[PDB]
């Protein structure tokens, strides 16, 4: 609506070639065409990415995965987005996406992490995960509390002691032998302790 | 000396990050293929999943972006000249017929 | 879908050998010599297993 | 010769977030690279938290 | 905490983890110490 427009004049594909010797580049070609020498990559995110809608002023968000193989499952990672700030990428054009700010779904600029209270994970309608009396509240992942009377918070904020233990172990392997500042190569930009700023 | 009867508010802001919950038996990273993904319970049988999120209320339609972390892997085979063949397999949430 | 997921975890290199072990021994010897000027390191999937 | 697409792309993949999180782990991210327009979105830390 | 070390006893400093020129970023390949 605001008159911005992009128009492509001419687009070229460039490709930089290493000037390898022709007996070396034929030996590497012949080795890399074997079945045992197949080049195998992985996606860095390595995740099936599911968007579940939350209505306005909605507190409880129940989801379900019907019945699947769970072999080689790695874990969960979740962040609340906005429907205004997330395009429908399944179509080639989203006419109802009237927003040109930062896209947290694509840029990685997530900011609604603090808007979570707790998470419950139950496999197979009865097996509460992690179970096994692991956490201080073992049937749920209390991320933050609004009323603390039993004193289960860290860092002079409302983040709980279960969830600070989980997030310092998910990122850093820190928590069973004391909490401390992780070294700066483990503590990247999109990591936990780099961005966790408690307030009062 | 005339300070009002105050009440304390505490919160946190943790931008730019994803709330990682690892599917490991001690919440640690002992490997990319965790010990519960190799478990006899979760590999030799099928399980349902019922996740339940309690969020803060917002006066706006919001989304929930859950990452079900898989092994999204390609293997690229180029047997002859001009032939390229890719085989994709992500586990658990495979998308092949 | 398979009761033993190992033949396709080893095929896709989810659980198996390092690239020093499943590749041909000439390609591993090639990639160590050319490592400072032509990196073949990130072209192959190395699994880590808990 | 074959016209068979080696890109079997999926709708519930996020290639952009896979690449934004990749550059954090393989390199320094506060630095600016104009050729790929690699300049990370960063709020001012004194404006967000007063 | 300690630089890498070989054990031939004598105690010999190992050259692994040192910085090099690489055509590809070194964090995705190795651990740089």
């Amino acid at each position: 609506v605001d008159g911005a427009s992009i128009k492509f004049d001419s687009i070229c594909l460039y490709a930089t070639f290493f000037p390898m010797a022709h007996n070396t580049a034929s030996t590497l070609e012949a080795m890399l065409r074997n079945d045992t020498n197949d080049q195998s990559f992985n996606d860095y995110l390595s995740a099936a990415n599911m968007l579940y809608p939350i209505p306005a002023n909605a507190t409880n968000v129940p989801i379900s995965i019907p019945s699947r193989n769970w072999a080689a499952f790695r874990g969960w990672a979740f962040t609340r987005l906005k429907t205004k700030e997330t395009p429908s990428l399944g179509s080639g054009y989203d006419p109802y996406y009237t927003y040109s700010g930062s896209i947290p779904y694509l840029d990685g600029t997530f900011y609604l992490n603090h808007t979570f209270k707790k998470v419950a994970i139950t496999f197979d309608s009865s097996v509460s995960w992690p179970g096994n009396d692991r956490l201080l509240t073992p049937n749920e992942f209390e991320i933050k509390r609004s009323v603390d009377g039993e004193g289960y918070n860290v860092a002079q904020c409302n983040m709980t002691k279960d969830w600070f233990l989980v997030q310092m172990l998910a990122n850093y392997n820190i928590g069973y032998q004391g909490f401390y500042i992780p070294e700066s190569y483990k503590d990247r930009m999109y990591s936990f302790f780099r961005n966790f700023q408690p307030m009062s | 000396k005339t300070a009002v009867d105050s009440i304390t508010q505490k919160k946190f802001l943790c931008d730019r990050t994803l709330w990682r919950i690892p599917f490991s038996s001690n919440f640690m990273s002992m490997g990319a293929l965790t010990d519960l993904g190799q478990n006899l319970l979760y590999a030799n049988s099928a399980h349902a999943l019922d996740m339940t999120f309690e969020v803060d209320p917002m006066d706006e339609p919001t989304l929930l972006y859950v990452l079900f972390e898989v092994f999204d892997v390609v293997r690229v085979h180029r047997p002859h000249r001009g032939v390229i063949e890719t085989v994709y397999l992500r586990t658990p949430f495979s998308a092949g017929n | 879908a398979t009761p033993s997921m190992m033949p396709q975890w080893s095929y896709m290199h989810i659980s198996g050998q390092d690239a020093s072990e499943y590749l041909s021994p000439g390609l591993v010897q090639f990639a160590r010599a050319t490592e400072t000027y032509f990196s073949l390191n990130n072209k192959f999937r190395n699994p880590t297993v808990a | 010769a074959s016209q068979l697409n080696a890109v079997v792309d999926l709708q519930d993949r996020n290639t952009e977030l896979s690449y934004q999180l990749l550059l954090d782990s393989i390199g320094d991210r506060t630095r600016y690279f104009s050729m790929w327009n690699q300049a990370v979105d960063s709020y001012d830390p004194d404006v967000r938290i007063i | 905490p300690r630089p890498p070390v070989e054990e031939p006893a004598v105690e010999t400093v190992s050259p692994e983890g040192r910085g090099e020129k690489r055509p590809r970023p070194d964090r995705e390949e190795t651990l740089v110490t």
Binding site: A77 | E69 | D18, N41 | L22 | -
Partner: peptide
């Protein structure tokens, strides 16, 4: 080298 494990998100 070829023994370095592959970069994945969170493991």
């Amino acid at each position: 080298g070829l023994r370095f494990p592959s970069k994945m998100f969170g493991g």
